[PDB]
Amino acid sequence: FGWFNRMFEKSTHHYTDSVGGILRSTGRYLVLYLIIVVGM
Amino acid sequence: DKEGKGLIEATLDAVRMRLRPILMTSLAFILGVMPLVISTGAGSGAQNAV
Amino acid sequence: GLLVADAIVVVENVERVMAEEGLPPKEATRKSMGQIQGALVGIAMVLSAV
Numbered sequence: 001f002g003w004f005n006r007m008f009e010k011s012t013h014h015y016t017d018s019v020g021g022i023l024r025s026t027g028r029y030l031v032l033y034l035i036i037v038v039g040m
Numbered sequence: 041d042k043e044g045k046g047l048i049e050a051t052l053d054a055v056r057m058r059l060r061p062i063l064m065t066s067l068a069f070i071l072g073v074m075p076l077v078i079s080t081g082a083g084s085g086a087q088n089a090v
Numbered sequence: 091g092l093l094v095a096d097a098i099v100v101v102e103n104v105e106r107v108m109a110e111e112g113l114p115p116k117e118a119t120r121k122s123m124g125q126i127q128g129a130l131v132g133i134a135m136v137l138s139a140v
Contacts, residue, residue, distance in 0.1 A: 016056050023048065057110070061102055065095045072091060 096133075099126055 022029075046053060076087040100123055108118040123130065 011056070011059060015059075016052060019055065020052060057106060058102070061099055065098050068094050068098070069091045072094070
């Protein structure tokens with residue numbers, strides 16, 4: 001009918017594929033999770 | 041291990057067919073825990089901080 | 091909240107291996123609580139730490 005469309009698209013390219021592109025990077029989250037932990 | 045491996049391609053195949061829960065479960069919260077934060081404050085000033 | 095939570099997983103698990111792989115009833119959750127086997131039971135043997 002058409003509602004699931006607004007999140008089924010946001011699950012793949014906007015999430016799962018941008019989720020590849022975060023350990024495709026890794027790097028900076030070593031210090032971002034220490035600005036977050038010691039910032040906490 | 042017991043299923044077909046994925047050093048990087050099983051951590052994605054898994055986090056694709058059941059995100060629904062971790063989005064609707066950690067959401068059945070949020071607003072079920074919000075009648076504590078606001079909508080009250082009269083009879084209980086403790087529901088606020090809880 | 092948590093009592094509402096961990097129930098949802100086995101409920102939506104039937105929406106996986108029935109709406110995805112087709113096969114209907116008492117087998118569409120049989121081998122599904124096998125990924126949440128100890129992730130259902132042996133959980134708050136240690137999240138029952140706090």
